[PDB]
Design a protein around this nucleic acid. Structure first.
Ligand code: MG
Ligand code: MG
Ligand code: MG
Ligand code: MG
Ligand code: MG
Lengths: 93, 274, 93, 113, 348, 64
RNA sequence: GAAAGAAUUAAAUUAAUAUAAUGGUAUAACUGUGCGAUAAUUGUAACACAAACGAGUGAAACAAGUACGUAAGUAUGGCA
RNA sequence: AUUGAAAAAAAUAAUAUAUAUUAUAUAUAUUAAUUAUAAAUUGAAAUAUGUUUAAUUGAAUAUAUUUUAGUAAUAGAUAAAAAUAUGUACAGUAAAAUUGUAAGGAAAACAAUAAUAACUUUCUC
């Protein structure tokens, strides 16, 4: 809500193939237009963002897929295994 | 002005008058910066800090265990010595300065559950010396710093003047940024994992590096900064790049304790220790 | 001689009205050399990165655990150790 | 007026600057404000409690160590001496890494050296 | 769920507004805030996301804490400790916070902010310390009303004065104000708000308005003047406005004589002091005290000596200050005081 | 001559005037002081004309 | 037992003071910051210091107006 | 006030309106704004009106009407880099030397370098 506008003009150069994709991914804010009632106040826009609200910015070549935090050992409840709890401190008894 | 004589009058009560509160001038400023009603509000505790959590869980107990010396008493530092009163000229005399040093040194306490060493602050001093010619280089350096940290840099200016190095006084030259809390922790984690392994012949931080009291430092070249993921992702946008000094400030009594702490966070140490 | 950007009149931030610089940051997933993913907040717009050279594949951080490429390609039929032993007489130096 | 380098510097400066990039102020209703206060205060209390728990635990550990070392001194002097050495250059092992967000492909290495 | 219970706990800890309470405690962020009165403004407004579930969790946490505190509170016997426990239990209650913050503390309605309740009293004290007390202290020190009349003050009660009977207008006097002779022609009204735990039934109070700056030409200095003197006044945390209604003619040790500053005599400080009586043990009911009415004089009045005699402790103070204007002669005439002197403009 | 003398003439047209010294190319010096003829604080302005070191008017409106 | 605050003690006037040198200055007279840009204003100035006269210096107070300050108050150019 | 969502009210402060008093008070209503300001044959966005695709909404594209982009530093009552040298209000403390740190070296920048007894609040055994 309090975050700044994303300065897209810096990270994406004007008239470039990379910028275009980013633009397509994004959706713009509703501008103020004369002779119309905006019952959620008049749009306050600068660098293409509604100042009155939170901004959302949607974004080898491979998707980064993280591994499951629960394990096979955990599922089986194998007490002798070391991979059975990954988020806790295990002690040898 | 009728006079320059400064002289604060004594009072007849023990109530502490906060003068700021009695005014009606700065109503937004009466709120604390932590308070939501202040324009200075910022969400502090946004997500769980990982390095800090690790320190809390694993390291802190281990550090305490390491630093236990049995019946260790306090080691007083070098202090200002008083004069022996063996002459009437000692009577309102200022005390003799410390033995070796001109400035007084702090007492070294035994490490207990309260005063275990931990990370206090990181400072990233970048003074670009080509910016004596080009002011724009200072700006670029500041941006780089901001990118690296996710924290607002502060501009460094030339405090001194010197002819040999073509340096004026009062000229913007690079930038600095004091990281604290979670951003600092993140920056350390990035340094440990991403950047320092990509440095080729990197032995580690020197064991001869540091303050006398809980402060360790090292520096990165312009070659090393291109390994930061924010800089690396747009090498077209970053043609020039500037080195930096990295002052790590710990809550350590002595420097070996600080080194040990940093090692706990996966910092390699190579040189012969003092 | 000295290259500069000449300053305009500074904008007066009133006392109390100063606001903290909350820069626009994305949650970015870093997959390290091995499959360990880590989330970090970052200013550059990239949801996923995978790293090649990290601490998790550097020998200094784990002691217990393309000219050369070109050469290999165009001297592949010969298969270039035995070759070293053949071509290493240590009399002349 | 300005060079391409000058332009790029200006752009870079803008990235850092708060000029026309920041939203409106976060205004709240009085009920909302109260709710926020109660959220924050409770959280702060919880954090304090956690700190005390950890601090208490550390104190307990210290006491146990003290108890041990006195006993060692009483019984076997050589063992006590061995225990109480300067661990100046003690370095944490590089395998004890800072726990990641998600685990690796190979969770645990059974062979080494 | 201790904070929903009102069997033993007072009614004041709840919010009296129903809509506000409903808004506070809902299962989703569906409703809109009662504070925003206007429809369009409500429509415009958007509360921060996820606030409800977290708030509920925080409430549960602090409610549990309060309940735990209460377990101790009832076992406790000594009164100050019990009060402190009660405060600890309820201070983090959202409802009591709402009540205190957003409704008037000066003229508190009993159902909303009850100063009989310890938590609310503590809150009021804290509020006083934050601003009003500091201001009062500053005005006492700067104007030199402390050492000139009565050595020191340890502010305990918040004292506010008013002059309702003279003009007609409603205004609580800010400490160190310049009031006209018309304004201060008839007597003032005090409100002594007490924040410490005190025996309401037994504890009596005295109120003395003193004028240190009336000129004595024999001494070539000034003398004090007891302009208004009340004794043996009964206060209650909510019922605390000292008015001709409350105090009787027996309580008036020196009935109100108005500020009538002389021309060029200067600015005259009128610093009201509020003392609490000495409390005697083994005696049920309010312990009165007799004042020797021939002994104490109004034209010259040792305040410190008087305090020493009757064993008083100054808990509160307030101050205004009057100087000469056209209507002081009229005021004198009304009261039947003499014409009034006129001094030289130069302090030679 | 580095510092010249000037005559500041009262704006309330009394005829009262006060004299002050300034640097040769200093900005136009107007000041509010007491005019005893009128018995109030009024503006004073330079009666004579003179050349000034022309400063560039700093632009708050972000140009180009 | 811990955290935070209020701070206190010690040291310092070696820096800094538009400018010489001396005295003073952290209770800051030094430094930062808001407002301001007014008091680098108008008539009477006693009384002192200094003092051959001519001059010089500090200045209470009275009156008119102004600026800052919640107030107390401070400002009749600059620590001298 | 109309619109969205699913009898009222009880602070401070600000704003609007009214009146009380040789008292810058009170009453009722409401909680705005908060880092902006002219000038862009070229970038980006919205809405409206058309046409084509799978009465419909998405998607594509044309015109019109707007909105944004002039990208520029202080974000802190800033505190010994440089800059407004006289007023006032609020606040703070310098320097040297030492130990370090990428180019950096005697000499550029940044960090660190006296003591917590008692007191208040908070959490806790
Ligand atoms: Mg000197
Ligand atoms: Mg003489
Ligand atoms: Mg003479
Ligand atoms: Mg000066
Ligand atoms: Mg000055």
């Amino acid at each position: 809500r309090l975050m700044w506008t994303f300065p897209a003009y810096f990270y994406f150069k004007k008239g470039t193939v990379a910028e275009h994709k980013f633009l397509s991914l994004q959706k713009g804010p509703i501008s103020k237009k004369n002779g119309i009632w905006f019952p959620r106040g008049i749009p306050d826009i600068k660098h293409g963002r509604e100042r009155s609200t939170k901004q959302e910015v949607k974004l080898v070549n491979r998707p980064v897929i993280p591994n499951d935090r629960i394990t096979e050992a955990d599922r089986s409840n194998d007490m002798k295994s070391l991979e059975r709890q990954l988020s806790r401190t295990l002690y040898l008894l | 002005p009728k006079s320059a004589c400064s002289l604060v009058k004594p009072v007849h009560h023990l109530v502490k008058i906060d003068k700021s509160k009695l005014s009606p001038r700065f109503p937004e400023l009466k709120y604390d910066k932590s308070d939501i009603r202040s324009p200075g509000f910022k969400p502090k505790d946004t997500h769980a800090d990982r390095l800090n959590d690790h320190y809390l869980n694993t390291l802190q107990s281990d550090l305490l265990l390491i630093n236990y010396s049995h019946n260790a008493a306090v080691v007083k530092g070098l202090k200002q010595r008083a004069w022996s009163g063996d002459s009437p000229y000692h009577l309102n005399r200022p005390p003799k300065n410390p033995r070796g040093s001109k400035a007084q040194l702090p007492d070294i306490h035994p490490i207990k559950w309260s005063n275990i060493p931990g990370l206090e602050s990181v400072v990233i001093n970048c003074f670009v010396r080509e910016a004596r010619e080009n002011q724009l280089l200072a700006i670029t350096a500041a941006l780089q710093l901001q990118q690296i940290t996710g924290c607002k840099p502060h501009p460094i200016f030339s405090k001194n003047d010197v002819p040999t190095w073509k340096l004026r006084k009062g000229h913007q030259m690079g930038a600095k940024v004091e990281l604290k809390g979670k951003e600092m922790s993140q920056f350390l984690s990035t340094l440990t994992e991403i950047v320092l392994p990509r440095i080729r012949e990197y032995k580690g931080i020197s064991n001869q590096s540091g303050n006398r009291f809980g402060g360790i430092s090292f520096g990165l070249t312009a070659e090393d900064i291109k390994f930061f993921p924010e800089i690396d992702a747009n090498q077209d946008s970053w043609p020039k790049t500037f080195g930096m000094h990295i002052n790590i400030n710990t809550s350590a009594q002595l420097d070996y304790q600080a080194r040990t702490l940093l090692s706990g966070f996966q910092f390699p140490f190579f040189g012969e220790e003092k | 001689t000295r290259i500069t950007l000449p300053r305009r009149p500074a904008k007066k931030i009133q006392l109390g009205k100063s606001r903290p610089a909350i820069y626009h940051q994305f949650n970015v997933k870093m997959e390290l050399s091995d499959g360990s993913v880590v989330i970090r907040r970052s200013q550059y717009p990239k949801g996923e990165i995978r790293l090649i050279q990290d601490q998790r594949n550097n020998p200094l951080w784990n002691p217990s655990r393309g000219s050369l490429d070109r050469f290999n390609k165009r001297y592949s039929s010969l298969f270039s150790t035995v070759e070293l032993s053949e071509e290493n007489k240590k009399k002349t130096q | 007026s300005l060079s391409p380098l000058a332009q790029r510097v200006v752009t870079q400066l803008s990235v850092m600057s708060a000029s026309r990039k920041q939203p409106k102020l976060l205004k709240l209703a009085r009920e909302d404000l109260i709710k926020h206060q109660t959220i924050e205060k409770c959280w702060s209390i919880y954090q304090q409690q956690q700190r005390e728990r950890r601090n208490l635990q550390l104190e307990l550990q210290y006491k146990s160590i003290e108890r041990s070392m006195n006993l060692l001194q009483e019984l076997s002097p050589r063992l006590f001496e061995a225990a109480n050495a300067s661990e100046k250059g003690k370095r944490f092992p590089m395998e004890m890494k800072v726990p990641t967000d998600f685990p690796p492909n190979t969770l645990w290495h059974y062979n080494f050296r | 769920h201790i904070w929903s219970d009102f069997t033993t706990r007072p009614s004041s800890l709840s919010i009296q507004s129903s809509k506000v309470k409903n808004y506070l405690f809902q299962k989703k962020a569906s409703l809109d805030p009662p504070s925003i009165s206007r429809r369009s403004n409500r429509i415009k407004y958007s509360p921060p996301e996820h606030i409800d579930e977290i708030f509920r969790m925080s409430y549960d946490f602090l409610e549990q804490r309060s309940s735990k505190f209460y377990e101790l509170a009832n076992k406790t016997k000594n009164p100050l400790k019990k009060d402190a426990l009660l405060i600890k239990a309820e201070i983090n209650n959202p409802e009591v916070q709402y009540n205190f913050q957003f409704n008037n503390k000066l003229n508190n309605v009993k159902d909303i902010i009850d100063y009989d309740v310890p938590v609310y009293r503590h809150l009021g004290k804290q509020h006083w310390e934050s601003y009003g007390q500091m201001l009062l202290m500053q005005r006492l020190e700067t104007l030199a009303a402390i050492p000139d009349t009565l050595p020191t003050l340890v502010p305990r009660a918040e004292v506010n004065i008013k002059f309702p009977f003279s003009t007609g207008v409603n205004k609580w006097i800010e400490p160190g104000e310049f009031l006209s002779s018309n304004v201060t022609s008839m007597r003032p009204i005090f409100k002594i708000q007490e924040y410490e735990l005190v025996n309401v039934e037994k504890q009596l109070y005295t109120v003395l308005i003193v004028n240190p700056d009336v000129p004595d030409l024999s001494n070539d200095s000034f003398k004090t003047a007891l302009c208004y003197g009340l004794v043996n006044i009964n206060l209650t945390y909510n019922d605390n406005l000292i008015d001709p209604r409350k105090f009787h003619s027996s309580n008036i040790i020196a009935d109100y004589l108005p500020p009538v500053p002389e021309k060029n005599a200067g600015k005259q400080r009128f610093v009201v002091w509020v003392f609490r009586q000495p409390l005697i043990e083994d005696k049920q009911g309010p312990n009165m005290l007799e004042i020797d009415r021939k002994e104490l004089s109004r034209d010259d009045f040792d305040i410190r000596q008087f305090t020493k005699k009757y064993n008083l402790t100054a808990i509160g103070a307030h101050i205004w200050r009057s100087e000469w204007d056209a209507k002081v002669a009229a005021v004198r005439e009304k009261y039947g005081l003499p014409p009034g002197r006129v001094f030289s403009r130069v302090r030679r | 001559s580095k510092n010249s003398v000037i005559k500041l003439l009262s704006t309330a047209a009394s005829g009262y005037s006060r004299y002050i010294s300034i640097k040769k190319g200093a900005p136009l010096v107007t000041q509010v002081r007491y005019d005893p003829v009128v018995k109030r604080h009024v503006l004073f302005k330079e009666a004579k004309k003179r050349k000034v070191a022309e400063r560039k008017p700093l632009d708050f409106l972000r140009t180009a």
